[PDB]
Design a binder for this molecule. Structure first.
Ligand SMILES: Cc1cc2nc3c(=O)[nH]c(=O)nc-3n(C[C@H](O)[C@H](O)[C@H](O)COP(=O)(O)OP(=O)(O)OC[C@H]3O[C@@H](n4cnc5c(N)ncnc54)[C@H](O)[C@@H]3O)c2cc1C
Ligand SMILES: Cc1cc2nc3c(=O)[nH]c(=O)nc-3n(C[C@H](O)[C@H](O)[C@H](O)COP(=O)(O)OP(=O)(O)OC[C@H]3O[C@@H](n4cnc5c(N)ncnc54)[C@H](O)[C@@H]3O)c2cc1C
Lengths: 467, 467
């Protein structure tokens, strides 16, 4: 009998990987997803879409500003917004098909519909046309995702007050835009539209922008987000939003000294946070215990209170990133299969894809401080990097943190274009409790942006050769 | 006088680093260089200049072809060739100053002039309509460099037929151009000008372009260069040339299938190889080893067939690259300082900065075949990299080579844009005899071109999750 071995309610990173990894381990698997296509949130409404726009907006910008200095003289430069959204969409889908086609290769049974627990072992799937399909397995992996964080006095239409999705799909470059949340998704939209033409301003309630980011780096990062138009109204809450006019009227009064002011804006991007998503999951019948917010509680082996049920991804505690998600999925399946699964949220990198990207792995100088341990810091600016200079794209710096005694690397933060590619050399060295010297002992190709990392390393235990 | 400790005849990577590492170690050091500025060759007419052009010529290309798809319209595009050469020059000097300023920092005594051995302890500097400065020291590091190469159709003369240098400073985009050598440098210039507007054709005597390149990768790499406009000619060579007025009249004769055909041109780039450059200095005096195709023979500690004397860089055996050089100079000095200096030409990375760059580290499949050791190959195309597709810049692949038994990595080859950065992840793992699994166990930031390396790894020892 071909008895079904695993069901995953969720078709995103946690799911389609868990699904796939599962098939590859030899399990009859069924991923189930209600959304239209199989990408997760990453594929249809975030990373990808977001990354795509980010690069089109950048091309536009580089073409209006840099081309000159290089001998590439253009006459006029515009933005066929209609097109842009095009390759974005072109890409998203394309990507999706490939996933669907991955499921076929690995024999994942794709069930379009909305799951709802009917028992610790059987799921009733909501709608394909208004019906009910019954999917049953020994082990079930909840992989529902996350969704938009609501904001108290700002209901979201889809109109001049948008979310992640709305922002990535406007149909008119707003003149004046205001982003409420001030984190990664926020700074990211802010950049997109802004490069395109908008006049953006961010309004955060918090003391600084992007709290998890390493201070020293943050400072310079903001400054850069500024140097090139952008503005932040820090430490400010918003009583009521006003939408009875041209654009949107904001009545922002700080997070204490209750003396309101009013911001004028066409569209307002609400980038407050994101919450787990369990809603409509049939979650009561067997009641998996959740925490104060909503994430689903889980153990080493990713199991819920309910023997037979697991949870991974943006639904359980941990950083809310696609690869963190991917990471749990696999770890989870390896365990199920009897192998040993390995996670470790302390080394799951973080990258903001703004103009200068800011990739970080390991701890921040702030955290190191908290551990009272004696450390040293190494730093090297791309202003000294041969490649960078040779290109005239030298904003940025590598910064590594090591134990003074051991030289063991604690964290490595980078601010620079294509930083997300460069942080890997650090990420791998950090995985194997390596030291500055070690990474500096590696011969790097010259000229390359990578050289910076090498130089930052030297600057850590010894002394740099180009600064 | 504060100069007697260490003497270095050469201002290139080998010399200026040697020179700086030295001062850093506690030696009164002196670098002597005949050229105008302190860059090496990897600064005044090589690496850098070359990279600069490459990028500029790329920007021009991309704006005439890619921009559309991203909703970026330009009304007329053209090349201010005068500007380009400029940024290039601006950048070049800019870097040089910094080097000079580095010597001031570490206290290297810069002595402009043309060295010449007067004794294993003394050399005779001087000039073109100039004095004759006096430096003699205990340990002397020869660091003269390398230079262009002959052929039976050479004309080392500014503008009619060029060298590396000429090509980097033409003053007129040639209608038809031909590059004779067909390797690193050659493909690069052919790419630079081909983008800009020239119609190029590369003529190599060798069976294939770029011999040291891994077959499989070479196969596709060529095919790529092929669609960008170049027409390669292999199995043939030029016996008759023709500086008769307007352009050359190349007479193409093959291996010995001898015959007569003609290549009409508007300029010819001769990218035959590069020879060590041991002239100036005086060897004919203190009988040093000059026994190979012109190289200065050496030992473990980098000492010649002579005391007090040393050699490093493009003048000694090994690969002719800046970081190889950089590597020798430092290993050399560390030794003199009584520390252990360590070099490894088997781990010195290779990168061709053409459109798809092609970076390789470790051995090629053909080399690994010769060892007769059982191995496995991992590959993964960018066509399936999310970052990559999201951008619409997915040409290329990542390919890992491991021992079937151990899984130790033997080599990593990458064909892709920005592949010169990507390779370090491999590069560093290969430095520490790590395994596919090892680099796959590393958590990679999604969505990044780096993921391809993680996938190509798993595809090696196990099975990938996206292909
Ligand atoms: C604008 C934006 C930008 C982002 N950028 C990045 C970035 O650059 N890098 C990064 O690492 N992360 C980024 N993220 C976050 C990343 O997308 C998430 O961390 C990741 O998708 C979480 O994976 P997941 O497996 O939980 O799946 P999710 O995609 O969150 O969710 C899986 C799917 O579950 C489905 N589902 C839920 N309940 C049910 C049910 N009952 N029945 C059927 N189907 C159901 C949903 O349709 C959903 O698509 C971004 C997010 C947003 C919103
Ligand atoms: C077009 C081109 C592109 C290249 N691109 C790359 C690349 O992308 N990446 C890479 O790694 N490598 C590249 N290379 C090769 C790289 O530049 C060399 O490997 C590197 O510079 C060698 O270092 P070196 O220490 O030997 O110095 P070199 O620069 O070769 O030589 C040092 C200096 O010695 C001076 N000198 C010679 N004799 C005397 C004397 N008697 N007295 C005083 N001074 C003297 C010369 O003027 C010379 O500039 C390229 C080369 C060329 C030609």
């Amino acid at each position: 009998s071909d008895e079904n071995d695993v069901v995953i309610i969720g078709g995103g990173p946690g799911g389609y990987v868990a699904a796939i990894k599962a098939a590859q381990l030899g399990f009859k698997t069924t991923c189930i997803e209600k959304r239209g296509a199989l990408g997760g949130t990453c594929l249809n409404v975030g990373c990808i879409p977001s990354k795509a726009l980010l690069h089109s907006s950048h091309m536009y910008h580089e073409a209006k500003h840099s081309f000159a200095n290089h001998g590439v003289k253009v006459s006029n430069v515009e933005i066929d917004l209609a097109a842009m959204m095009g390759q974005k969409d072109k890409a998203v889908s394309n990507l999706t098909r490939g996933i669907e086609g991955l499921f076929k290769k690995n024999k994942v049974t794709y069930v379009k519909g909305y799951g709802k627990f009917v028992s610790p072992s059987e799921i009733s799937v909501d709608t394909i046309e208004g019906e009910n399909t019954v999917v049953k397995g020994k082990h079930i992996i909840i992989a529902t995702g996350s969704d938009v964080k609501s904001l108290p006095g700002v209901t979201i239409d889809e109109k001049k007050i948008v979310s992640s999705t709305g922002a990535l799909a406007l149909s008119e470059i707003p003149k004046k835009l205001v982003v409420i949340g001030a984190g990664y998704i926020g700074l990211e939209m802010g950049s997109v539209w802004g490069r395109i033409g908008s006049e953006v301003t961010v309004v955060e309630f918090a003391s600084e922008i992007v709290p998890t980011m390493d201070a020293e780096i943050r400072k310079q990062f903001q400054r850069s987000l500024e140097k090139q138009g952008m503005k932040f109204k820090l430490k400010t809450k918003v009583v009521g939003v006003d939408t009875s006019g041209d654009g949107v009227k904001l009545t922002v009064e700080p997070s204490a000294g209750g003396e309101q002011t009013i911001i004028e804006a066409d569209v307002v991007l609400v980038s407050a946070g994101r919450t787990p998503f369990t809603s409509g999951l049939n979650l009561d019948k067997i009641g998996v215990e959740t925490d104060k917010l909503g994430r689903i509680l889980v153990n080493e082996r990713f199991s819920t209170n309910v023997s037979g049920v697991y949870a991974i991804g943006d639904v359980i505690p941990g950083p809310m990133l696609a690869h963190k998600a991917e990471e749990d999925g696999v770890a989870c399946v390896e365990y199920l299969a009897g192998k040993v699964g390995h996670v470790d949220y302390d080394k799951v990198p973080g990258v903001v894809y703004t103009n200068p990207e800011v990739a970080s792995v390991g701890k921040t100088e702030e955290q190191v401080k908290e551990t009272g341990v004696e450390y040293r810091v190494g730093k090297f600016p791309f202003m000294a990097n041969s490649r960078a200079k040779a290109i005239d794209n030298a904003e940025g710096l590598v910064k590594i943190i090591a134990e003074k005694e051991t030289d063991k690397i604690l964290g490595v933060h980078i601010m620079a274009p294509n930083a997300g590619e460069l942080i890997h050399e650090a990420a791998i060295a950090l995985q194997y409790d390596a030291s500055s010297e070690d990474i500096a002992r590696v011969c790097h190709a010259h000229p390359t942006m990578s050289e910076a990392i090498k130089e930052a390393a030297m600057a850590t235990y010894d002394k740099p050769i180009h600064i």
